[PDB]
Amino acid sequence: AGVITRRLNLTTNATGSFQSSQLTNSQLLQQQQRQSHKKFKKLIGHEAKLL
DNA sequence: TTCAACTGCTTTCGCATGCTCCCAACTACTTTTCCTCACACTTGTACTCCA
């Protein structure tokens, strides 16, 4: 389909004009929810004296 | 004059597409905190050879 010109990060989602892919409006709460799902990383200090 | 010219534009369909990793698999040495007791000196109480 012709020739590839460029590529930038916006996304049409509002049946016409676009409302998506605006950068780091959610990244502040992205990398503070990634490392709570898995558990028990064993970076343990006074803990395990107990366990 | 005589001649090319190369640029411009148009149908026909259309064929229609062109600094080097990032992560697996091997492996290895090192990382991290724990664990159970040897060495040696010293101190005691004794009985020896002390005049």
Report DSSP letters for A10-45, one per residue. -B--SSSS--B--TTSSGGGTTTTGGGSS------S
Residue A5 CA and nucleotide B26 C1' are separated, in Å, by 43
Give me the resolution in angstroms, 1 decimal: 3.1
Residue A38 CA and nucleotide B37 C1' are separated, in Å, by 43
Residue A15 CA and nucleotide B24 C1' are separated, in Å, by 43
Closest Cα partner for A13 from A25, A21, A5?
A: A21
Enter the tokens of residue A37: 């799902």
Residue type, A2: G
Residue type, A20: S
The experimental technique behind this entry is cryo-EM
Enter the tokens of residue A43: 């970076």
Chain position carrying tokens 């989602």: A13
User: CA–CA distance from A23 to each of A8, A13, A43 (Å)?
Assistant: 11, 15, 32
